[PDB]
Amino acid sequence: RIKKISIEGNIAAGKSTFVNILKQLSEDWEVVPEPVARWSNVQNGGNVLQMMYEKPERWSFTFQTYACLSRIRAQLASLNGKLKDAEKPVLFFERSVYSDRYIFASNLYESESMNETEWTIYQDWHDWMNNQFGQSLELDGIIYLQATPETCLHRIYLRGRNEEQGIPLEYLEKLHYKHESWLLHRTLKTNFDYLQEVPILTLDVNEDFKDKYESLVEKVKEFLSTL
Amino acid sequence: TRIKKISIEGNIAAGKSTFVNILKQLSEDWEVVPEPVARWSNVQSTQDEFEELTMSQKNGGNVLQMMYEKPERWSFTFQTYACLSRIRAQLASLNGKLKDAEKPVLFFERSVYSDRYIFASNLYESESMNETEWTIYQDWHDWMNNQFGQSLELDGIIYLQATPETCLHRIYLRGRNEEQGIPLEYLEKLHYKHESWLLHRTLKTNFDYLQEVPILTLDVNEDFKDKYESLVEKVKEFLSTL
Ligand SMILES: Nc1ncnc2c1ncn2[C@@H]1O[C@H](COP(=O)(O)OP(=O)(O)O)[C@@H](O)[C@H]1O
Ligand SMILES: Nc1ncnc2c1ncn2[C@@H]1O[C@H](COP(=O)(O)OP(=O)(O)O)[C@@H](O)[C@H]1O
Ligand SMILES: Nc1ccn([C@@H]2CO[C@H](CO)O2)c(=O)n1
Ligand SMILES: Nc1ccn([C@@H]2CO[C@H](CO)O2)c(=O)n1
Incomplete structure (x- = not known):
């Protein structure tokens, strides 16, 4: 009965910021943050986020599986015990298992950072992992925060995560076109049929x-009353 | 889950599939879930429903061969997929086999416990997996077990013990192409892990019930x-103890 809304957009578009703001309007509303802290210290442990940026042809598949797993784990845990003694519960996910696969992993595959075997395994793993564990996780709606790749590049410097400071503009441009094709042009098709009516x-x-x-906060309130 | 779950464990080419495929013929309440080795040597993901009508299911990569050729690069990738494909196969047969059995028994060729505590652990111990890879693998494997709880828990284990030299010869007899370069030293390491887990029972697992299965x-x-x-007789006797 919890409404699950994914907040999507490029790196440093402003998703945690906006969603931490939005959370305070209702006791009924909670957020599941993207577990970037777990990625940067594997558990002090390895920095698999940094390994993927420095050696993407080596560490990409490993990063992506850990990324998707940590997200599902965190999303399932918030569903299972939080809110529910609540009038109209909303859970906002910072991204989803669908961007994991169809934006980020897909882009690593198109860049030759994952080979064809790695990509086939990733998709098999993702298909199975979602068909079991991720049934309770289907989205009721999606909020797309758009910001240009130049804005996102600026906001990467502003935020100051060390692993990200060498991200080139052209990398952010590629991730932007994928979001636009998914969420704006709607030309990117998934193997999840319910997603086309979200x-x-x-x-x-x-x-x-x-x-x-x-205006933005209010548009979110408008949008959520409809679902 | 009145179905009894029995895993068959032992080294490569010990004779696990030969034994259990013959053994299961003694009862209609006995079935076997094979190890998905064929899925590992020919990697494939599911086709779209419209694409499969016009496009063949192509032969994909051989992650089994990749692991054998460069374990330091491919171990984590191989082991993750090895465990996933096993769990998928084991749960499906649990959900859909032996619905009209009187005393149903499902034999598993190996288990998720040997994936981790024998094979992946040996790769880590050989430094074919690094600390980050071993941490991720274990975290994944842990979380997955929690999720099922008692779904795949074993009622018993049958350990088929064969010397490294026997397995090595049997690898040659069987003729599986990717296994032909396996040195005796590798088989001997796997041999010592089974003996610790299954015979001397000194190997410690995160799964407490195993200590008494x-x-x-x-x-x-x-x-x-x-x-x-004598084997078939020991097995029938064993099964009535459970
Ligand atoms: N609208 C905005 N105007 C100026 N800075 C913003 C805005 N939204 C977010 N930021 C800043 O940009 C950086 C990235 O925001 P963050 O919420 O961390 O991005 P994301 O969660 O999408 O990766 C942070 O420094 C944050 O303070
Ligand atoms: N007891 C045995 N005596 C002679 N050959 C055996 C025996 N058990 C198995 N084999 C042969 O050894 C090879 C390996 O057996 P297999 O069951 O495929 O092993 P596993 O399933 O443990 O890898 C096959 O060629 C099989 O015919
Ligand atoms: N599956 C994912 C998810 C996110 N990312 C990138 C890498 O870190 C940032 C965090 O916003 O996003 C990624 O590279 N892969
Ligand atoms: N998790 C596993 C399971 C089995 N193996 C080896 C590799 O494949 C052969 C098939 O018996 O055995 C392995 O290397 N890792």
Whole structure:
């Protein structure tokens, strides 16, 4: 009975920021953050996020499986014990198992960072992992935060995560086109048929946060009352 | 889950599939879940429903061969897929076999416990998997077991014991192409792990019930005819203890 909303967008578009803001409007609303802290210290452990950026042809498959697993684990745990003694419970996911596969992993495959065997294994693993464990995780709606790759590049410097500081603009441009093809043009098809009827709210977040944040929060409230 | 689950464990080419495929013929309540070795040497993911009508299921990579050729690069990848494909196969047969059995028994060729505590652990110990890879693998494997709880728990284990030299010869007899370069030293390491887990029972697992699961050790070093009778008898006796 919890409504599951995924918040999607490029790296450093502003998703944790916006969603941590939005959480405070209702006691009924909670967030599942993207487990980037677990990725940076594998458990002090290895930094598999950094391994993937420095040696993507070596570490990409390993990173992607750990990434998707940590996300499902965290999403299932928030569903199972949180809210539910609540009038209208909403859970916001920072991204989903669908961006894991169809944006990020897919882009590593198209870049030759994963070979054909690695990609076939990843998809088999993802198909099976989701058909079992991830049934309770189907999305009721998606919020797309769009910001240009230049904005996202600026916001990477501003935030200052060490593993990310060498990300080139052209890398962010590739991830942007994939989001646009998925969530704006809707030309990117998944092997999950329910996803084609999931409503999408696109929000422009290119501006500084004083500029639009009232309209944005309100649009989210409008959007959620519909579901 | 009135179905009794019995795993068959032992080294490569010990004779596990030969024994159990013959053994299961004694009852209609006995079935076997093979190890998905063919899926590992020919890697394939599911086709789209419209694409498969016009496109053949192509032969994919051989991650079994890749692991044997460069274990340091491919071990983690191989072991993750080795365990996934096994769990998928084991759970499906649990859900759909032996619905009209009186005393149903499902034999598993190996288990998720040997995937981790024998094979993957030996790869880590050989430094074919690094600390980050071993941590990820174990975390994954742990989380998956929690999720089923008692779904795949074993009522018993049958250990088929064969010397490294026997297995090495049997690898040659069988003729599986990717196994032909396996040195005796590798088989001997796997041999010591089974003995610790299954015979001396000193190997510690995160799964507490295993410390007390009934185990039957059978020597399969002899030619097949020479001992099959005594074996089948030990097995039937064992099964009635459970
Ligand atoms: N609208 C905005 N205007 C200026 N900075 C923003 C805005 N939204 C987010 N930021 C900043 O950009 C960085 C990335 O935001 P964050 O929420 O961490 O991105 P994400 O969660 O999408 O990776 C942080 O420094 C954050 O303070
Ligand atoms: N007891 C035995 N005596 C002679 N050959 C055997 C015996 N058990 C198995 N074999 C042969 O040894 C090879 C390996 O057996 P197999 O059951 O495929 O091993 P596993 O399933 O443990 O890898 C096959 O060629 C099989 O015919
Ligand atoms: N499956 C994923 C998910 C996210 N990423 C990148 C890598 O880290 C950032 C965190 O926002 O995003 C990724 O590379 N792969
Ligand atoms: N998890 C596993 C399971 C089995 N093996 C080896 C590799 O494949 C042969 C098949 O018996 O055995 C392995 O290397 N790792």
